[PDB]
Structures are given as structure tokens and as C-alpha cells.
């Protein structure tokens, strides 16, 4: 996260950290959507151009973790993966379309003041919340510049009008993505960065006071460059897939 601020304790309880089991290595961000399901970006698990193709056995996940240094004992939880599911039409060759993956935990995580799942948008929550100018919040332990923090980083960013996102990049953009960021002439800056993929773009519902995950950090060009808003997987547009995976029948 570029130009963000240290996270307050317990402010992003659904935050998940995806680590390589051996050697120990922070790979990406993620999010808790149930006590057994973790949502992330597909490229955090499968990306041939970078020699990436992990299996369940290769990874682990940490939840409720506030310091990358310290080990808040009865606060953070470590879980192994039972199974990995990557969107079938995930396009890693061209534009990262449908950059989304689901990781089923071996065993359920008990909810606490420091660990809680984020809500997935229903049709009308998306309809009202997904508007250019409306701000969402992105969180992550990735790079602070185009190393990384000792504490979770947080940054609030405005959703950018599709025509503007499309004009900002040569990558063939799709409806399954959206971009967010500040205008060059506007003062504040901010963006996600490498290491942040898989992390949640969340919004608070003014209707029921709940936080909903509207996107997943997916990609960008550099980090926090003027005129270069970062991109996110559009969670609601891919909800049917998430449903068929979690509710196989």
C-alpha cells in the first residue's frame, strides 16, 4: 500500500495473509468470507509468466495478525488449506480477467474481536455502492512504493468512471474489473502495490452499517502513478462462481 496509514487494531478483522509454507514468505493478501472460506486473487496462486503455480500443500494462511514481527499468541490464527479453487475462465495470458480464487480452510476459524468475516455484496448493495466518486477502502502488507510495513496499511480511494479506467491503460479491460484512485490535480494520493493482490476493497453500507467486499486487489501499472489508478476484480460480477464453489449443489 502506497501512501496509506497504519491500521487501527481490529479495524480490518477479515484481513488474511497468504504465506508460502517453506520457506516462510508473505505472498499476498486475502480476506475471510466465512469461518472456512478465504477469498483471494487467482494470480496469487497461478501465474505461469512468473513461474507461479502453488498447490494447497505449498501454502498457509494467517488471520488476526497485527504485527509481522510479533506473534499475538491467542490472537492470530494459522490455518492450512484444504482445497484451492481458481476461476475457470481466469485469463492470465492477457488482462487478468476474473482474477479471483477461493481457498477452503482445513479447519474453521473461531470469530473473535480480531477475526471476523466481511460481507459479500448482494445485487442491490452493489447497485447502490458501486458508483464513481464513492470511496472504498483497501488494506495490505505489500510494498509502500513502486520495502513493506511492519503494521497493516490502509488507504481510502474513490472509484473511477469506467471510461477513465479504460483510457488509462493499454490492457484490454473487462466488466469483471474496476479501477480506483485520485485525480492528478486533487491533493491526496494512494494505491495498492505489489504484495497487496488478493486483499479486499471494502465499502461500508450506509444502509445497514456493514462492510462489504466490493473488489479484490488485482493489478496496475507501477504503484500510485499520476493518471494510473489501480485495478480490482469485481466481486459481485463473479458471485455466481463463488456460490457454485461454496454451494457445489
Amino acid at each position: 500500500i502506497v501512501e496509506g496509514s497504519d491500521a487501527e487494531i481490529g479495524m480490518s478483522p477479515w484481513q488474511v495473509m497468504l504465506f508460502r509454507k517453506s520457506p516462510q514468505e508473505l505472498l499476498c493478501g486475502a480476506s475471510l468470507i466465512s469461518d472456512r472460506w478465504v477469498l483471494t486473487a487467482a494470480h496469487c496462486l497461478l501465474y505461469p509468466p512468473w513461474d507461479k503455480n502453488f498447490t494447497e500443500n505449498d501454502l498457509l494462511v494467517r488471520i488476526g495478525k497485527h504485527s509481522r514481527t510479533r506473534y499475538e499468541r491467542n490472537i492470530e490464527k494459522i490455518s492450512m488449506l484444504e482445497k484451492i479453487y481458481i476461476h475457470p475462465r481466469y485469463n492470465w495470458r492477457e488482462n487478468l480477467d476474473r482474477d479471483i480464487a477461493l481457498m477452503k480452510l482445513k479447519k474453521p476459524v473461531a470469530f473473535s474481536d480480531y477475526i471476523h468475516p466481511v460481507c459479500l455484496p448482494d445485487r442491490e448493495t452493489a447497485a447502490s455502492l458501486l458508483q464513481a466518486g464513492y470511496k472504498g477502502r483497501v488494506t495490505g502488507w505489500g510494498n509502500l512504493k513502486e520495502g513493506q510495513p511492519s503494521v497493516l496499511q490502509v488507504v481510502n480511494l474513490p472509484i473511477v468512471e469506467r471510461p477513465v479506467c479504460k483510457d488509462s491503460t493499454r490492457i484490454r479491460i473487462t466488466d469483471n474489473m474496476f479501477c480506483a484512485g485520485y485525480k492528478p490535480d486533487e491533493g491526496k494520493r494512494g494505491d495498492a502495490c505489489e504484495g497487496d493482490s488478493g486483499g479486499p476493497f471494502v465499502m461500508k453500507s450506509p444502509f445497514n452499517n456493514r462492510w462489504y467486499q466490493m473488489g479484490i486487489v488485482s493489478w496496475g501499472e507501477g504503484c500510485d502513478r499520476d493518471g494510473k489508478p489501480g485495478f480490482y476484480t469485481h466481486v459481485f460480477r463473479l458471485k455466481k462462481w463463488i456460490q457454485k464453489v461454496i454451494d457445489q449443489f
Binding site: 487494531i9 481490529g10 477479515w14 468475516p117 460481507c119 466518486g133 470511496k135 452499517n209 456493514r210
Partner: peptide, 27 residues
């Protein structure tokens, strides 16, 4: 379901330091 509500914030009827920026963006 039990989601989107944080024990140390919404459940305590306490806002975090920057969530007003989000609410205000809706206007």
C-alpha cells in the same frame, strides 16, 4: 450471517478514524 460488523467498532457503536471519509463520499 455474522459479517461486516467489527466487535471493536460497530459493535461498540464506535467509528474508526477514517470511515467518515467513506460515508461522506456518498454525501
Amino acid at each position: 450471517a455474522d459479517c461486516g460488523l467489527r466487535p471493536l467498532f460497530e459493535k461498540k457503536s464506535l467509528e474508526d478514524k477514517t470511515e467518515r471519509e467513506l460515508l461522506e463520499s456518498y454525501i
